[PDB]
Design a protein around this nucleic acid. Structure first.
Lengths: 206, 64, 146, 116
RNA sequence: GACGACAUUAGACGAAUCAUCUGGAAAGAUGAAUCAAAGAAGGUAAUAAUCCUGUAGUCGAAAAUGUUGUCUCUCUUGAGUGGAUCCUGAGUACGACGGAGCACGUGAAAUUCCGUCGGAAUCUGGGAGGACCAUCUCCUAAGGCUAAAUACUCUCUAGUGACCGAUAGUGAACCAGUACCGUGAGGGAAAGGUGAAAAGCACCCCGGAAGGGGAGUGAAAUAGAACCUGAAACCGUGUGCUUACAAGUAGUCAGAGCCCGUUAAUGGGUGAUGGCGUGCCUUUUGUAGAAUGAACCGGCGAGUUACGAUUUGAUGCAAGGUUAAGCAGUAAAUGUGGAGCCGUAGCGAAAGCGAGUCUGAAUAGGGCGUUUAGUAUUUGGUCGUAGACCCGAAACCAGGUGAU
RNA sequence: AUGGUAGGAGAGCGUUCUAAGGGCGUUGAAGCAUGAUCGUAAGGACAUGUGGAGCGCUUAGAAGUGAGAAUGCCGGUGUGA
C-alpha cells in the first residue's frame, strides 16, 4: 500500500501510503460490467424514427371496391405491404439511460483503480509545473516516465496548461479527480496521478 | 401509464398478511325465514378467495 | 478489466424469444397462439375478470365496510429494538429517528412488548402497551406519556 | 438501425439449385419446385437406404436356390442343414462362392445333406 | 444620459516532409525527419496532422453597444393610539324552476356559472368552514392592472446521431405537389452513378442512314453516353453422353456402356435397364385430392416501444434498503438532493387493541396471524393501458364539391 | 433413453450497427460466377475468373435481425402463338 512519488525527471521524490480500501480490494467484474454498459448507454441519443401508415402522406381513400372484380382486397395505398410506405414496428425516439445504486457506482470505481494498481499500471508524481502549454514537453515527460500509448492523467481540480498540452496527443486523456469515470479508467493502460489528487480520491471513496 | 384498480373488488375484499384475500359471504341481506339459524350463523363466517379465482383476478388488486 | 475482454456475470443475460421466424424455433406460424378464436386475434383476448357472461365473482359477492379518513397509525417499536441503547439513557422520538429505528413518525410512537429487554432506561412516547410498560418497570425505568 | 436482405437469400437458394442439378427442366432453374424435389429426394433416399438391404438379400437367396437345385436340393433344406451342421456363413458369401468356386459349394452341400 | 467586448458577427492571419518501391496516379509499404493551445472534417489521379480548403488560437468594423458598472432630472427618510361617529363596490348577494361546469351521474348540491321569475342587509354588519341550527376559526364579494418560472416551432444561425442510403429516407436527391386522372372539390407517380481528366472515338472500310469493323485516346472502351458493379427469370448458338415398341409427382436405390480428369478422395459427367414412389401450403375426423392459394423471377412485406403490475435469474447492501423533481456538469458518467416509497406486526367494518387480535356474555372453541429478510437496479417470461402481430368490411358521423 | 402436430423448456447459426483490441487490402476490398471442400444443422473457408475501394477477426453490446405462399405491393420476363 506504499507507492513511490516520482518527479518529471523520473528519478524519485518520495513515497506515499494509499488506502487498500480504495486501491487494494478484490475487483468486482460484474459491477464493473454493469457500470460500463450503463455509461455507454447514457451517451446515446436515441433519435431515430419512421413513419407509420397514419403518418405517411395520402392513403385516405380505398383504392377499389371491396369485391373489385378479380383483385385482392385493399384499404389504402400506404399500407405496409405496399411499396409506397407504412412501417409497422420501427424505431421510436427514446432514451437508453438507466441508473443503479450509489454504492455500486463507488464499488465499480474502487475495483477499476485496484485493478490498475495491482497490474502495476499506477504511477504517482509530484505536481505538474507547466507555466505554458507545450505538447512537445509533455511528450518528453511521457517518454521519461516509461508510459504506454494509452494513459490517463489525473489532476486535483483543474490545470488548463497541462490539459492543453496533452489534448492533441493520441491515446492520452486528461481528467479531474472529481470527474473520474470507469470507462476512461478501463480504456487506459496506465494511470498517472498527482499526490493531491490521489489523496482527494482516497478521501471521497474511502 | 399506471395500472388502475378494480374499485368494486376493492370495497368487497381485503388482503391478509401472507398474500391471501379475505372475502364476505353471499346469500345474506335477504330472505332468511326459508333458511335455518344454522345456515344464518354459518354464513357469517369469513372465507378466502379461491386460488382458481386468484389466477383470474390477481391483476385487479395489485395495489391493494 | 479490458473493454476487449468484457464478460457479464453468469446467468445475468438471456436472449429474447423471437416469434414468427420459422418452424424450427417451435414458435413459427401461429406464434404460440394456437389456430383460431378470440385470443388468436390481434388485440384479442378477453378482459381480466370476464367469465364469459357468468356473473363475475366481484358481483356475486357483497361489499362490506367503510374507511375512516382520519385514522391514527403509530410507528411501532418493540423492546428487542431498544437493547442497542445503553442503560440509564433517556430515549425520545427524536433520538429514535436519529438512531434510525424509526423512519417516519406517523401519528406518534408506540412501544410493544414482543421481545426481551435486558436493559434499564427511561422512555418518552405517546402510547404504550401494558406488557411493554410492565417489562420496562420490571428491570427498572420509567415510562412518561408525552 | 436498418438491415436489408442482402446476399443470404441468394446463397441459400443457390445451393438448393445446385443440389437440383440434372433434374428435368424447371426443376433445375426454379427455387420453389427445386426445393420441393430435394426434400422429396432426401425422403426417398432415407427409405431406399433400408430397401437396399432387403433387395440384396432377396438377390442372394434367389442365387442360392438356383445353385442348390443343380445339386437337387432346395434353399430351405440347404439352410436347415447348414444351421444344423453349425455353418454360420452369410448368404452373400454363399452366393459368391457358388459363382466363383462351384466345387467348394458342392463340398459343403455334402455336409448340409449328411447333417440330415 | 460619457453610457466602458451584440455574439466582438461579415472578414484577415494561422506551425510543421523529404526520399525510394509498386503504380496510370500515391496520401499506401519501406526509411529517415518535423509541428502540435492545431491528431475536428473534407478534397487532392489510391488510405495525408506537416499538398489545398481548413482546425486550435490571435487580431478584428457597420447596423452595433454585452445591456452592462456612479449612471443629470426624479425617487419613498412612515409619522403612532383609539377606532366612539361617517365611508368601505344593488336589481348585487341570495332564493325557486330548468340546465351546465366542478374527480362528483342535477341532487341534500355544500362550492362555482347561464336563462326566467322574485329580491336584502350595511361593522351590534356580511361571507365561508359538503343539508340545516348554535358555539368557535378564517375572511371582508358584487371595481381594475400585473413581470418570472410555463406551452409550441412555418422559420433562422451553429451543430449532433450504435437515423435512411435511391422499392429506403420527405409524396418529391432528377423535370414535384410536376407528367397524369377527375366537370369539380380532390388524388397523385415513375425517374441518381462514363472517367482522375472529355482526353467524348481524327482517319479508312461496308451501308441510304442507323448500326458496325479496324485504327486511335485511355490504366481500362464486353468504361463509348440505352455509359460503376451487372444476379435470376427469359431468349439463343455450339458441342460430350443420350433418345422414334413407349404409359411417365419425373425423382430415388441398384447398375452396364461411353466421355472426362478434381479443393485427389474408396473422383466427376451422361444414363441401356430393374425396383420403390399420387407435389407444397392452409384448413380439416379425414385432402393425391375434382377443397384453398401461388404464371415465373427478384425486391419489399407481420408480437414492437413507452408506462405500470407480477414472477424468475444476476448483483449490491442488509433490520434496513432506496431516492424523485431540481441544482452543478460535455445533450455523459458522476456529485448533491431524504418530500416521499417498501420492509421491520398483525387482527378488526370501525373506535381500537397489540404478538396477539376478531367473534363471543366467556380467556373457552375457531378464523387470520408470530414462532425473520427484505430492499434498489437490471435480464428473461406473462399480463394490463395505448391501433398493440399484420392485411381486409358492409356501414356511422362532421365539413365541403357537384344540375356542363 | 432419443416417432411426434397445439404447445412448454434449452442450446446455437447467420444479418446491419457500435465500443475496444488486433488485422487485411491496387502485389487488388466488398459484391458476382464456378468448383469434385469443412462442419451433427442453421452455415463457414480456400482456389480461380470478373470487379476496381473498402472489409474481415476476437469479446461484449444494440436491433427496421432471416419469407414460398396473405385472389399480398412494385417492377422485369414468359405461356397461350
Amino acid at each position: 500500500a506504499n507507492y513511490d512519488v516520482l518527479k518529471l525527471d523520473g528519478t524519485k521524490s518520495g513515497s506515499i501510503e494509499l488506502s487498500d480500501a480504495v486501491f487494494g480490494i478484490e475487483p468486482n467484474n460484474s459491477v464493473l460490467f454493469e457500470a460500463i454498459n450503463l455509461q455507454r448507454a447514457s451517451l446515446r441519443q436515441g433519435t431515430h424514427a419512421v413513419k407509420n401508415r397514419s403518418a405517411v402522406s395520402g392513403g385516405g381513400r380505398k383504392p377499389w371496391k371491396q369485391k373489385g372484380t378479380g383483385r385482392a382486397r385493399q384499404g389504402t395505398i400506404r399500407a405496409p405491404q405496399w411499396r409506397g410506405g407504412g412501417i409497422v414496428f420501427g424505431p421510436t425516439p427514446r432514451s437508453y439511460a438507466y441508473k443503479m445504486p450509489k454504492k455500486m457506482r463507488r464499488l465499480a470505481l474502487r475495483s477499476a483503480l485496484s485493478f490498475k494498481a495491482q497490474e502495476n499500471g499506477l504511477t504517482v508524481v509530484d505536481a505538474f509545473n507547466f507555466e505554458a502549454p507545450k505538447t512537445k514537453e509533455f511528450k518528453n515527460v511521457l517518454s521519461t516516465l516509461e508510459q504506454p500509448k494509452k494513459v490517463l492523467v489525473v489532476t486535483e481540480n483543474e490545470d488548463v496548461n497541462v490539459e492543453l498540452s496533452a489534448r492533441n496527443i493520441p491515446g492520452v486523456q486528461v481528467t479531474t479527480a472529481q470527474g473520474l469515470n470507469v470507462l476512461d479508467i478501463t480504456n487506459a493502460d496506465s494511470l498517472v496521478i498527482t499526490e493531491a489528487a490521489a489523496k482527494k480520491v482516497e478521501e471521497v471513496l474511502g | 401509464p399506471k395500472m388502475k384498480t378494480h374499485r368494486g373488488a376493492a370495497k368487497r375484499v381485503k388482503r391478509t398478511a401472507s398474500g391471501q384475500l379475505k372475502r364476505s359471504r353471499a346469500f345474506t341481506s335477504h330472505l332468511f325465514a326459508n333458511k335455518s339459524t344454522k345456515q344464518k350463523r354459518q354464513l357469517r363466517k369469513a372465507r378466502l378467495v379461491s386460488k382458481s379465482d386468484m389466477k383470474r383476478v390477481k391483476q385487479l388488486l395489485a395495489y391493494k | 478489466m479490458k473493454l476487449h475482454e468484457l464478460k457479464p456475470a453468469e446467468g445475468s443475460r438471456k436472449e429474447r424469444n423471437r416469434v414468427g421466424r420459422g418452424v424450427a424455433t417451435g414458435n413459427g406460424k401461429t406464434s404460440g397462439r394456437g389456430h383460431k378464436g378470440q385470443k388468436a386475434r390481434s388485440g384479442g383476448g378477453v378482459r381480466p375478470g370476464f367469465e364469459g357472461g357468468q356473473l363475475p365473482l366481484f358481483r356475486r359477492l357483497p361489499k362490506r365496510g367503510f374507511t375512516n379518513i382520519n385514522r391514527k397509525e403509530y410507528a411501532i417499536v418493540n423492546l428487542d429494538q431498544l437493547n442497542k441503547f445503553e442503560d440509564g439513557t433517556e430515549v425520545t422520538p427524536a433520538l429514535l429517528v436519529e438512531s434510525g429505528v424509526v423512519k417516519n413518525e406517523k401519528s406518534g410512537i408506540k412501544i410493544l412488548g414482543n421481545g426481551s429487554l435486558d436493559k434499564k432506561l427511561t422512555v418518552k412516547a405517546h402510547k404504550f402497551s401494558a406488557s411493554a410498560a410492565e417489562a420496562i418497570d420490571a428491570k427498572g425505568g420509567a415510562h412518561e406519556v408525552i | 438501425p436498418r438491415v436489408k436482405g442482402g446476399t443470404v437469400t441468394r446463397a441459400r437458394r443457390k445451393k438448393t439449385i445446385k443440389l437440383a442439378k440434372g433434374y428435368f427442366g424447371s426443376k433445375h432453374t426454379l427455387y420453389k419446385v427445386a426445393k420441393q424435389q430435394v426434400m422429396k429426394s432426401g425422403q426417398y433416399a432415407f427409405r431406399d437406404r433400408r430397401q437396399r438391404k432387403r433387395d440384396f438379400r432377396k438377390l442372394w437367396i434367389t442365387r442360392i436356390n438356383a445353385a442348390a437345385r443343380q445339386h437337387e436340393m432346395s434353399y430351405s433344406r440347404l439352410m436347415n442343414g447348414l444351421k444344423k451342421a453349425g455353418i454360420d456363413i452369410n448368404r452373400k458369401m454363399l452366393s459368391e462362392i457358388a459363382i466363383s468356386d462351384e466345387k467348394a459349394f458342392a463340398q459343403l452341400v455334402t455336409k448340409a445333406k449328411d447333417a440330415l
